[PDB]
Structures are given as C-alpha cells and as structure tokens.
Amino acid sequence: QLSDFQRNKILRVFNTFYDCNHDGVIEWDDFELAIKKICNLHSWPTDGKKHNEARADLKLIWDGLRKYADENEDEQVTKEEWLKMWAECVKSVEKGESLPEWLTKYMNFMFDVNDTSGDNIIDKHEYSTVYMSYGIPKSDCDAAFDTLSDGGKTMVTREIFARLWTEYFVSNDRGAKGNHLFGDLKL
C-alpha cells in the first residue's frame, strides 16, 4: 500500500484543494464552492461560458470520483474511502495502467484555471495567483515554481503539468519534482 510520504501527499491534497468547506468529506457542496472560489479569482460572470463550462466538467469529475471511491453510495467521500481508493489506484498506475478519467479531467481543469492568458503555459504569476488563493504562502509558490519549471529551463505546458500531476500522487521518490506541484514541500 501507501508509505507515510504518499499518504500525507494524498491527504494534504484532500484537506487543501478538495474539501473546500473544510468539514472532513468531499461532496458536491465542496465543488460548488470551488466554482465560486475560481470565479471570485478570475472575475467570471455568474452565468458566462467559463462558469457553466466549469460547472459541467466538475459534475463529470465528481461523478467520476464518486463512482470510484463512494463504496457506501451516500454521495460523500470520506478520507477513509479516499485513501482506500488511492491505495489500489496507485499500485495500479505502477503496474502499467494510466489514471482514472476523472483524475485527468481535474488535471486539465486545474491547468486551464492556471493558464489565464491561454497560451498553454503556466507562468510564475499565474501560478502563484492561483495557489495563493488556496492558502499556500507566496514563497512556497516561488520555491515550487522554480522546481517545476526547472529554474526556467522547462516550459510548464499542459503536457508537462500532467506529468508533474502523476509524480505528485504516485511517486515515492522524495527527489521527484512533481512532489512540489501544489506548493513547496520541505523534504
């Protein structure tokens, strides 16, 4: 199963990015929250393309996560179910098979949220603008971004971001740069 390192990486994300209302479970309510949070960030109209567009993708993502981790079918993902899922989902990515569809779907969703200007590149400002809005300190965005972009040597494109996403969730390597996808970890 998952090491202390992996567990904590998987939990850190649960508590930070998924459990918006901060009550200890994931539900549709946390997603209506995200949508609000990102609209406030980018000043999208409550009813524009981006708002409804985003509401569609999250309905998909949620529907994906929950037909996947919600063993007990009550429309709620517990940390217990989250971890139980990730356990087998991880040992299955290190046996050859790729991620679940909903998880790629969230990754593209996140990428598009970052890539404000829409040139297919996350620049340092766009990055810190997002991740500061989830509580990650400005300095942990700068330390992170220098790692993910490789002091400027690598362009953070949709493709590169997806590969860092997988490293984050699955790698048991402390040296792996995808570890700092969501803000700098002291390792």
Binding site for Ca ion (CB under 5 A): 19, 21, 23, 25, 30, 70, 72, 74, 76, 115, 117, 119, 121
d(CA 47, CA 38): 13
Nearest approach in angstroms of CB 127 to Ca ion is 9
Smallest distance from the beta carbon of 186 to Ca ion, in angstroms?
A: 27
Shortest reach from residue 44's CB to Ca ion, in Å: 17
Which DSSP symbol is given to 77? E
Q: Is residue 34 within 8 Å of 58, Cβ to Cβ?
A: yes
CB-nearer residue toward Ca ion: 21 or 172: 21
Copy the structure tokens of residue 10.
Answer: 């998987």
Q: Is 75 annotated as a binding residue?
A: no
Contacts for 56 with CB less than 8 Å, ≥ 6 apart: none
115 is in an annotated binding site: yes
How does DSSP assign 108-125, residue by residue? HHHHHHH-TT-SSB--HH
| Cα-based angle 142, 148, 151 (whole degrees, multiple of 5) | 70
Binding-site residues for Ca(2+), please? 19, 21, 23, 25, 30, 70, 72, 74, 76, 81, 115, 117, 119, 121, 123, 126
Binding-site residues, please? 19, 21, 23, 25, 30, 70, 72, 74, 76, 81, 115, 117, 119, 121, 123, 126
